[PDB]
Design a protein around this ligand. Structure first.
Ligand SMILES: [Hg+2]
Ligand SMILES: [Zn+2]
Length: 255
């Protein structure tokens, strides 16, 4: 799998037949169709005690890893029942500014999209959560091209270091709190991971309010490579999956 012409999302079904499943992500968020649910409590983001370990180029994107051996960086409340631990964050960006986001809002695409992955602590480890219908909780954050995001610059500078798939670098004392928007207004629906295995274990929480980043901050993302060192260079762009059919599922709004 990849995002290329012959291994793109349109081919994932042959290896991961769940691609054509019942609760696949991402989707289009029809705002007029979304249902305002008043029984939704506000989001609870406790990242004050977060511990980042490193950043790796996995060949499909770059991941920032955190220590999830203790309730250090957690998400609870909202549509969730129980505590969800942060394990990693990554992005999906486009080749141009008119694309990159996975999830869409009234068919509108953003420059990039941030995913904060968390796993349900009653399951013990990430590996066991992916075997559950309520296994994961991902926090979706859209990025638009504007003024620079000071809190994202640390991530941006270390990229020179992980240009190719396989590369990784020490990356401690990173506060995710810096990538959060002002409002925590959200949309929530049942879905999956948006890259193979596409496990239908995720509870999506997409915030209404996007963060803005500079053209230069987004430009460094596009300098990444899918390939490993010493292989023909194929730039890491359009690492996003097209929107899937909603299929009965309903999107609730917390606002
Ligand atoms: Hg699952
Ligand atoms: Zn993702």
């Amino acid at each position: 799998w990849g995002y290329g012409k012959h291994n793109g999302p349109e081919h994932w079904h042959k290896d991961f037949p769940i691609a054509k499943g019942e609760r696949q992500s991402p989707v289009d968020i029809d705002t007029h169709t979304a249902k305002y649910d008043p029984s939704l409590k506000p989001l609870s983001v406790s990242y004050d005690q977060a511990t980042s370990l490193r950043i790796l180029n996995n060949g499909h994107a770059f991941n920032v890893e955190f220590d999830d051996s203790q309730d250090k960086a957690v998400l609870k409340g909202g549509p969730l029942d129980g505590t969800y631990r942060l394990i990693q964050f990554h992005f999906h960006w486009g080749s141009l500014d008119g694309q990159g986001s996975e999830h869409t809002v009234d068919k509108k695409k953003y420059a990039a999209e941030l995913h904060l992955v968390h796993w349900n602590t009653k399951y013990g480890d990430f590996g066991k959560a992916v075997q559950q219908p309520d296994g994961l909780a991902v926090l979706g954050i859209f990025l638009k091209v504007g003024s620079a995001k000071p809190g994202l610059q640390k991530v941006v500078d270390v990229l020179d270091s992980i240009k190719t798939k396989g590369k990784s670098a020490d990356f401690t004392n990173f506060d995710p709190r810096g990538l959060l928007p002002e409002s925590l207004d959200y949309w929530t629906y049942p879905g999956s991971l948006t890259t193979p295995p596409l496990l239908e274990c995720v509870t999506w929480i997409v915030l209404k309010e996007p963060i803005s980043v500079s053209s230069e901050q987004v430009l460094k993302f596009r300098k990444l490579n899918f390939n490993g060192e010493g292989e023909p260079e194929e730039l890491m762009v359009d690492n996003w999956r097209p929107a899937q059919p909603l299929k009965n599922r309903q999107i609730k709004a917390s606002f």
